[PDB]
Amino acid sequence: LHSEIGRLNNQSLLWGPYRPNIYFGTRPRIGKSLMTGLMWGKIESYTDFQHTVRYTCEQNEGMKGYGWDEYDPRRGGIQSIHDIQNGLDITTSFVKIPGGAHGGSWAARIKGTLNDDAPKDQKTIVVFYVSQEGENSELEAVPSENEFGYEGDVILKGRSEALGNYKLVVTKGKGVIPQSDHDLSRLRGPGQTVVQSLTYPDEVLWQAKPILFQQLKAGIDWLVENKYDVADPPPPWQVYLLANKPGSGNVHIVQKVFEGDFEFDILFSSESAGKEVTSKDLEREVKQATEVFGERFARVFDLKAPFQGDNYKKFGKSMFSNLIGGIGYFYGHSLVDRSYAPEYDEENEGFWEDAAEARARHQEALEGPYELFTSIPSRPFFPRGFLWDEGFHLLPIADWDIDLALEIIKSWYNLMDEDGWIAREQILGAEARSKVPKEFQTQYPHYANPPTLFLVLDNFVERLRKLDETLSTASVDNPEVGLEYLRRLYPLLRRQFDWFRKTQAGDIKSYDREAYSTKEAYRWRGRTVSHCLTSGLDDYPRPQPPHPGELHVDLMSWVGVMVKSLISIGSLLGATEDVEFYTKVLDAIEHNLDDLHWSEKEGCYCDATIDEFEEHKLVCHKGYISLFPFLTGLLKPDSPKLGKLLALIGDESELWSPYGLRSLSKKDEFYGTAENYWRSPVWININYLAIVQLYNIATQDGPYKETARDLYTRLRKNIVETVYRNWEETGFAWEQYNPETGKGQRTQHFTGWTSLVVKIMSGHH
């Protein structure tokens, strides 16, 4: 039955608009298969379309905003795009229609409405680009009846092992098609839908813009060659209209030009499903998906006071849909340094110089291929999987559809190598790599990232203890299914645990260090003079200079998180010998958190280093790091330490701004210095952890119950309002928020752990 649920999940999730790196496109969760993508741009001159055309996601002054209004990967959704440069408000509706044996069918409607500023007679070029990778597969454009192009629908017939037989239709659509009275219309037609069918080597099919432009350029060359010149030039839009040439290939370009408003449909009909998909099907299925999305939201994300109003609901829906709508499927080789150079052990003083030297050997090479199914932080700026981000992303997604989240956790864990390492940044394939400077592609097997994915697992466990609707919760509703999932995952979790203790070990024994345990001590590998990228808190201030004697209280706390998870999951699978070992590790981290990391002088936790004189020194920088044992759920609800931490959190002159907790204290010498990434701004992921822990203490008997209740109430309020206020005014979720002004800053489209705000509003943790 676990095998059955798994198959039903596969079939359910196979198709989607799983190319979040582009405004709109589809691919199934198959490495080498059928992909589609949308392009559009106004054309006003002979040279503008190359600058106006849209394809891959960006965010500049020419784009007001875009995002998903509603989305569920099992059903589909609606995206809206507000494009200033091209004077166009666009809607892309996508819907899935289950059936057959090949992952069902799907349809999309592309609707373009000129805005009030646009010339009413704008010419807009629209392209539907279709590619198919694979050795023994075929795809053919059924030729036109008419001679220069299509009056009606374009039908592509294709086949592959993965998808069986299928047909993909691009409908005639609605709107004015401009007509040219030029001489050229005798050879090229007055103006009509055209198709070019081409073949390129499989590995470059992803390069849709260059492929299209190469065709446009050959068209213009043909004009030049055939005496079409500036004495008497055809209109721009006709100059940029491809000569119709449908046939067989692994690339099909479908081009339309519209004057004024337009819309057209794309109908993917899986043959094995029987009756083929129509436009009326699309419409009906689109209305149904919305109704269902509506009913689930109200149930899963029931916003508590004072956020019950419709404005906050709209806000919630937008933050949630953008997060779950970012889900992508990624496939290909990634770039890894597999030298295990001994400089990466970072055992000496000045280790960062040695590690640089090793990197300068450039032993990195492509390996794989790998696949990942994941949500992402940022469509426009970094549309790819990040390990500790995904932990936060799945908290709201798990609420919505636990089986989806588990599917994604599983996807992540299938990347883990024999040592127990998952690269913290997954850049899979040439497409993914295109967005990333080569200097920043290489992953390093000694680089950790927080194991926040355990938090999702913890939530699943608590849920497990206590048609698409069914599937979304099959792994909790059938405890048999759930347990088997943990059984299969469990060894990899343990593997990762061991990998942390092996590769991210700190040094107790070589120094004058006294502590309850000789074992428990941790130091993030990969730190440079100004940075510790692997911790997630890029430029939060750390001991200077970096030093092999360093210990990092955030890292120990994460190890505490994992061991507590391993206890619960172990105990579920009766891995007694394991649960006893974990118990002793937990006990030891608890003592060593205090022995090595507590500052009585300062009233908080600190990282530690080794003196100019070989002694253990604490290095306190009051901020997120200082709160870690609290954030990670490690302290007892009556700890006097916790109570001091509550004072630090609530203290306006340190951490507490009107807009949320500051990453660093205003008192800290490093406040608002350098790039000021994690040195003051308010970050929603850490604030979310604070909010959850405050609420925990608030709903339990103890000395801080009421203190927590006040802080919880205010912090929830402050964080939600800041993110709402910015969304209201800018249309965007931001990466981080300014504690002085409350303004969103750094990158937009950060959905992204900023979307945790839906869960904060939802409450009842």
Ligand SMILES: [N-]=[N+]=Nc1ccc(NCCCCCCN2C[C@H](O)[C@@H](O)[C@H](O)[C@H]2CO)c([N+](=O)[O-])c1
């Ligand atoms: N103008 N334009 N603006 C930009 C700005 C940046 C940019 N690239 C950024 C590549 C690394 C992204 C790291 C973000 N986060 C850091 C955080 O500290 C971590 O904790 C967290 O895990 C990660 C992931 O969320 C690009 N671009 O196109 O590559 C265009």
